[PDB]
Design a protein around this nucleic acid. Structure first.
Ligand SMILES: O[C@H]1[C@H]2c3cc4c(cc3CN3CCC(=C[C@@H]1O)[C@H]23)OCO4
Ligand SMILES: [Mg+2]
Ligand SMILES: [Mg+2]
Ligand SMILES: [Mg+2]
Ligand SMILES: [Mg+2]
Ligand SMILES: [Mg+2]
Ligand SMILES: [Mg+2]
Ligand SMILES: [Mg+2]
Ligand SMILES: [Mg+2]
Ligand SMILES: [Mg+2]
Ligand SMILES: [Mg+2]
Ligand SMILES: [Mg+2]
Ligand SMILES: [Mg+2]
Ligand SMILES: [Mg+2]
Ligand SMILES: [Mg+2]
Ligand SMILES: [Mg+2]
Ligand SMILES: [Mg+2]
Ligand SMILES: [Mg+2]
Ligand SMILES: [Mg+2]
Ligand SMILES: [Mg+2]
Ligand SMILES: [Mg+2]
Ligand SMILES: [Mg+2]
Ligand SMILES: [Mg+2]
Ligand SMILES: [Mg+2]
Ligand SMILES: [Mg+2]
Ligand SMILES: [Mg+2]
Ligand SMILES: [Mg+2]
Ligand SMILES: [Mg+2]
Ligand SMILES: [Mg+2]
Ligand SMILES: [Mg+2]
Ligand SMILES: [Mg+2]
Ligand SMILES: [Mg+2]
Ligand SMILES: [Mg+2]
Ligand SMILES: [Mg+2]
Ligand SMILES: [Mg+2]
Ligand SMILES: [Mg+2]
Ligand SMILES: [Mg+2]
Ligand SMILES: [Mg+2]
Ligand SMILES: [Mg+2]
Ligand SMILES: [Mg+2]
Ligand SMILES: [Mg+2]
Ligand SMILES: [Mg+2]
Ligand SMILES: [Mg+2]
Ligand SMILES: [Mg+2]
Ligand SMILES: [Mg+2]
Ligand SMILES: [Mg+2]
Ligand SMILES: [Mg+2]
Ligand SMILES: [Mg+2]
Ligand SMILES: [Mg+2]
Ligand SMILES: [Mg+2]
Ligand SMILES: [Mg+2]
Ligand SMILES: [Mg+2]
Ligand SMILES: [Mg+2]
Ligand SMILES: [Mg+2]
Ligand SMILES: [Mg+2]
Ligand SMILES: [Mg+2]
Ligand SMILES: [Mg+2]
Ligand SMILES: [Mg+2]
Ligand SMILES: [Mg+2]
Ligand SMILES: [Mg+2]
Ligand SMILES: [Mg+2]
Ligand SMILES: [Mg+2]
Lengths: 48, 177, 98, 136, 48
RNA sequence: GUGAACAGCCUCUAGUUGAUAGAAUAAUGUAGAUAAGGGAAGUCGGCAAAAUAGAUCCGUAACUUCGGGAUAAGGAUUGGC
RNA sequence: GCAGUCAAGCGUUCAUAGCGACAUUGCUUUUUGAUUCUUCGAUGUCGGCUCUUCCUAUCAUACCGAAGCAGAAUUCGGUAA
RNA sequence: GAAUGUUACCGCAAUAGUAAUUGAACUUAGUACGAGAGGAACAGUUCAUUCGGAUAAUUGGUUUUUGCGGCUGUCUGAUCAGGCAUUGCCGCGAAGCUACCAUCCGCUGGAUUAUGGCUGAACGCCUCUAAGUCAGAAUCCAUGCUAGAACGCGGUGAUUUC
RNA sequence: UGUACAACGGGGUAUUGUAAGCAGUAGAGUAGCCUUGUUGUUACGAUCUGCUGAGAUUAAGCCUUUGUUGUCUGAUUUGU
């Protein structure tokens, strides 16, 4: 907990996210979800 | 964004306004021609199916079926083509055009009703506007009544009344062919 | 928040992702990553690069069900007649015979 | 920046240190601009001052009309090529370095700007806004 | 845990990016309920 | 074998496989590399480094003791089948 | 090199806002001299690069007093390294 | 890192260090002042510089991931698959490391100086000063921040039997 | 001796850019036999196409796991 009550404007601003990235951090991720990836890729040699 | 809806069965039209990204979001990434179920856009239109027919972005440039893209481009346009009326024999003008894929930049989405959902939309289903003109060519009267080349048209031509204040008149076409 | 696409490869560029190249003629080229970006700088031709959309589109790879039929049609038949001309005496005179 | 720069400018990656030569993208007669200083930039042992989009530099015309050569005039930077990043998250870069010669108040010497212009420059200097075609 | 990216609108009347989206990096820390196992009382002394 | 080649690189014959060894891979080194944007602003000074390069064709200034300058400069080309 | 005291003048008028002659009392030791005390069985006897710290006789920045300070700008001075 | 019973956990804080800096724009305001020419500032806001401490989602750099692919010369009868060329060469390249080339963060109380004052004698008057006293600076002391005295210290756990 | 630990295996995630093999009416073309072609036939041909966004690699400081396999008391020292 901060040791003072900042007025700042910068503090006080009441954020609200629109979108939180969720693509892989282990590479140049392209897809938020498996659902998204499945959507865009089409059907693969594994799969159904 | 503004929705311009037509019910091509009554010849109705009325515009609707929708200020809700989520309620809008349905039409995004949809092209011209793709069908769109209704309930997503409101509760009024539950079931109602919409065909997407075009629209204008802010700046007013029009969509053009089959460009794909959800952006603007500048095309060469010719005779017999949308978003262009040639001013001179064999003239083509190079004009900006908006894509056929719906984005949040559209000021207006043009829409057509294809199936009427479970409820009535006021200025649309409830009102029905008559077809201005009637059949003028010979066989066309014969087909807008189904008559066989026996029945004689001259009395099946349509007749539109009008008044001159105290003279009520009558004027039928001029059957060609 | 618009997701963009890669103008070499065709992948979705979610936000803050990859680079953006404003070419001399003001044509703009959005890349999702340094791969497309270098192939692109290398005057490589996306149609010859297997993993690209543009490739696959032109080689008809795994589209399968988009060329499969559908069910999108209507059924009307509503009389309106002709304005000024009695839309009343235009269905009773429309009894036909054949 | 400074004089005639109405507005502020969020920091953008310095791309042209002193000695850089940018294409001159107006119609004044000048073909290139040789950067000799950067306006409103500070001091550090051995740091070269460096300009970025929408910066005012002092320059000379190394290759241009003779009436534009052998003298120091102001200029404004309009295209980068060193990748910078906007607050909307995008790293972008032009294909060349390019500014246009201007007076201290930030008025153009010539009357067209040939080529695209970065928005962060258009925003910054009005008469540069005017003479633009494609911005960004 | 790590970091991801965020997109949100900015509320900063005066800024060029007022009412425009910004993209911002964030860190995430894993935060399962702490459990209380004791209290400890301190007193003031002239040695602290 | 490649290639203009007694070059470099790989091979046959022959001959070696000697050079304290193990475990780690901190700073600083020695030797080998790369680096966005800028391009000598560094420095006594471009020191170091980078750039260039083979061949075939096209093209080639000043000046000169007429022999040269000259691979001047500047360009295109080059695989496989 | 730096800082004073006297105050004849300078400053339209007005010694001392800002200055200041003839004189005169000082401080400093990045000047140069004077000396020759230490080192001649050797204290690496230009400058730059780097990097720390210290002085203040303060260029900037904080807060002040003063003006021949209307404003703007400037100048003199204090506390200040 | 030996020795202050052993061992473990949680803490205190002496002393020492300490840090932030400067500019501009908008607005005030074409306002105060001025015949005119010109022409400010406090409050508010947005950015910046120089400095510092981190950090690696993003972008960029790095490449023995010798990871995938490509190429020359040769050697393994060919094929598959490979060896060698002080890491043979080239394109991409994850992870790590990393950059004002990238992002994020850099605290608020008091006491004071100069100075302007209060009350006020000395000196019936007068004086900020003698007693007493108010306001006050990039100063100082704290707050915060970094060590933690290996001879400063507290609380607490468990403490060996063949 | 248990939401134990490890070695493999699996699944995710990632990197490359389409494996080997086979097939083909793709292929500038080329030989060979005759029964000299109203696709004559048998092969060969850089490359191309299909099975095939395949194959390979993927923690060595990525994520994960109902499977498989194994491991689970050696040493030394300390007391107010
Ligand atoms: O050592 C001697 C001096 C010296 C003698 C030299 C020499 C250098 C020096 C250095 N000087 C500094 C002070 C010194 C004092 C002494 O006199 C030295 O180079 C050759 O001889
Ligand atoms: Mg006719
Ligand atoms: Mg790269
Ligand atoms: Mg990279
Ligand atoms: Mg030009
Ligand atoms: Mg220097
Ligand atoms: Mg010349
Ligand atoms: Mg104009
Ligand atoms: Mg021998
Ligand atoms: Mg030896
Ligand atoms: Mg060894
Ligand atoms: Mg290691
Ligand atoms: Mg470089
Ligand atoms: Mg150059
Ligand atoms: Mg120099
Ligand atoms: Mg030069
Ligand atoms: Mg120098
Ligand atoms: Mg020299
Ligand atoms: Mg020199
Ligand atoms: Mg050299
Ligand atoms: Mg190079
Ligand atoms: Mg020569
Ligand atoms: Mg020569
Ligand atoms: Mg050829
Ligand atoms: Mg006198
Ligand atoms: Mg006077
Ligand atoms: Mg006088
Ligand atoms: Mg001196
Ligand atoms: Mg000596
Ligand atoms: Mg001696
Ligand atoms: Mg010495
Ligand atoms: Mg010596
Ligand atoms: Mg002192
Ligand atoms: Mg002083
Ligand atoms: Mg006066
Ligand atoms: Mg004072
Ligand atoms: Mg200091
Ligand atoms: Mg001190
Ligand atoms: Mg001990
Ligand atoms: Mg004992
Ligand atoms: Mg104004
Ligand atoms: Mg006046
Ligand atoms: Mg390889
Ligand atoms: Mg084979
Ligand atoms: Mg060998
Ligand atoms: Mg060798
Ligand atoms: Mg990396
Ligand atoms: Mg920094
Ligand atoms: Mg702090
Ligand atoms: Mg205190
Ligand atoms: Mg008083
Ligand atoms: Mg006082
Ligand atoms: Mg006192
Ligand atoms: Mg007194
Ligand atoms: Mg007090
Ligand atoms: Mg301070
Ligand atoms: Mg505090
Ligand atoms: Mg201790
Ligand atoms: Mg203790
Ligand atoms: Mg095991
Ligand atoms: Mg394939
Ligand atoms: Mg298994």
């Amino acid at each position: 907990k901060s040791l003072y009550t900042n007025t700042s404007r910068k503090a006080l601003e009441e954020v609200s996210l629109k979108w939180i990235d969720t693509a892989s951090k282990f590479g140049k991720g392209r897809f938020q979800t498996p659902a998204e990836k499945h959507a865009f890729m089409g059907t693969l040699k594994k799969d159904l | 964004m503004k929705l311009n809806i037509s019910y091509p069965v009554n010849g109705s039209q009325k515009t609707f306004e929708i200020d809700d990204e989520h309620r809008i979001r349905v039409f995004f990434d949809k092209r011209i021609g793709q069908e769109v179920d209704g309930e997503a856009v409101g509760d009024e239109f539950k079931g109602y199916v919409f065909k997407i027919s075009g629209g204008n972005d802010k700046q007013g440039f029009p969509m053009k079926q089959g460009v794909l893209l959800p952006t603007r481009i500048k095309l060469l346009l010719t005779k017999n083509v949308s978003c262009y009326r040639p001013r001179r024999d064999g003239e083509r003008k190079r004009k900006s055009v908006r894509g056929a894929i719906v984005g949040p930049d559209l000021a207006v989405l043009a829409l057509v009703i294809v199936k009427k959902g479970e409820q009535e939309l006021e200025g649309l289903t409830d009102t029905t506007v008559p077809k201005r003109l009637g059949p003028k060519r010979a066989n066309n009267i014969r087909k807008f009544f189904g008559l066989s080349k026996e029945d004689d048209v001259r009395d099946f031509v349509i007749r539109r009344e009008v008044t001159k204040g105290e003279k009520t008149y009558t004027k039928a076409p001029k059957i060609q062919r | 928040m618009k997701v963009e696409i890669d103008s070499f490869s065709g992948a979705k560029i979610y936000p803050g992702r990859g680079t953006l190249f404003v070419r001399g003629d003001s044509k703009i080229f959005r890349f999702q990553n340094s791969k497309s970006a270098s192939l692109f700088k290398q005057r490589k031709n996306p149609r010859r690069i297997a993993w690209t959309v543009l490739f696959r589109k032109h080689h008809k790879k795994g589209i399968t069900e988009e060329v499969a039929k559908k069910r999108s049609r209507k059924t009307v038949k509503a009389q309106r007649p002709i304005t000024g001309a009695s839309l009343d005496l235009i269905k009773e005179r429309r009894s036909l015979k054949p | 920046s400074g004089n005639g720069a109405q507005g502020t400018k969020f920091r953008i990656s310095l791309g042209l240190p002193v000695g850089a030569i940018m294409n001159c993208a107006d119609n004044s007669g000048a073909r290139n601009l040789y950067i000799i200083a950067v306006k409103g930039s500070g001091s550090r042992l051995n740091r070269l001052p460096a300009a970025s989009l929408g910066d005012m530099v002092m320059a000379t015309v190394k290759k241009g009309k003779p009436e534009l050569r052998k003298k120091v005039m102001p200029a404004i930077v309009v295209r980068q090529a060193k990748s910078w990043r906007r607050r909307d998250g995008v790293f972008l870069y032009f294909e060349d370095n390019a500014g246009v010669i201007a007076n201290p108040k930030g008025e153009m010497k010539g009357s067209a700007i040939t080529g695209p212009v970065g928005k962060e420059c258009a925003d910054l200097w009005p008469r540069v806004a005017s003479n633009s075609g494609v911005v960004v | 845990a790590g970091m991801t990216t965020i997109v949100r609108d900015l509320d900063r009347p005066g800024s060029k990016f007022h009412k425009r989206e910004v993209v911002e990096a964030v860190t995430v820390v894993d935060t399962p309920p702490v459990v209380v196992v004791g209290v400890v009382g301190y007193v003031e002394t002239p040695r602290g």
